[PDB]
Design a protein around this ligand. Structure first.
Ligand SMILES: O=C(O)c1cccc(O)c1O
Ligand SMILES: [Cl-]
Ligand SMILES: [Eu+2]
Length: 176
């Protein structure tokens, strides 16, 4: 394999939501925007919206379930976000169960809990460093202002426009 990636930003360029409220962040979020060094706009076959549900466990980790519509079916992808060094950061539980994965970080960049969130992810897999930012909405649509803010923020982390995608709203799988 050969591979050329935009470098992950230093974490000093990634804000952390002040006074993160883990209980209020729970529930379903729609992925309204998606950007990252391995994310590519594809006009031919556009990315479909998917959803990610955060459930706070008794131990204060999250069970995180993502639901995607692929090949006419609902695909479920489950992981555990374990609280990290400060509130609003997380690491991946059971990292040994993911082959090639040596590092995984989540940082909630901003949210008002009941409409929108921006979340930064960074991982090292097969020794390659990937990062993405998701724009989450409690609904499938968000204002132009929030989408443009997400574009500006993604660009501030070094991502050009073709690495920034707005998944198309769908009704299958993600409406339950
Ligand atoms: O894409 C890529 C990526 C980056 C950060 C976190 C992830 O889960 C990813 O799949
Ligand atoms: Cl608007
Ligand atoms: Eu992933």
């Amino acid at each position: 394999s050969t591979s050329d990636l935009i470098p992950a930003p230093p974490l000093s360029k990634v804000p952390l939501q002040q006074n993160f409220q883990d209980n209020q962040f729970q529930g379903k979020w729609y992925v309204v925007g998606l950007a990252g060094n391995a994310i590519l706009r594809e006009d031919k076959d556009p990315q479909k919206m998917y959803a990610t549900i955060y459930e706070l466990k008794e131990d204060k980790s999250y069970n995180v379930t993502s639901v995607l519509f692929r090949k006419k079916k609902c695909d479920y992808w489950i992981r555990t976000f374990v609280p990290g060094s400060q509130p609003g950061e997380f690491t991946l539980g059971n990292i040994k169960s993911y082959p090639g994965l040596t590092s995984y970080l989540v940082r909630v960049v901003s949210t008002n809990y009941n409409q929108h969130a921006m979340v930064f992810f960074k991982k090292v897999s097969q020794n390659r460093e990937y990062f993405k930012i998701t724009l989450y909405g409690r609904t499938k649509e968000l204002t132009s202002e929030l989408k443009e803010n997400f574009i500006r923020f993604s660009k501030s982390l070094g991502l050009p426009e073709n690495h920034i995608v707005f998944p198309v709203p769908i009704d299958q799988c993600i409406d339950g």
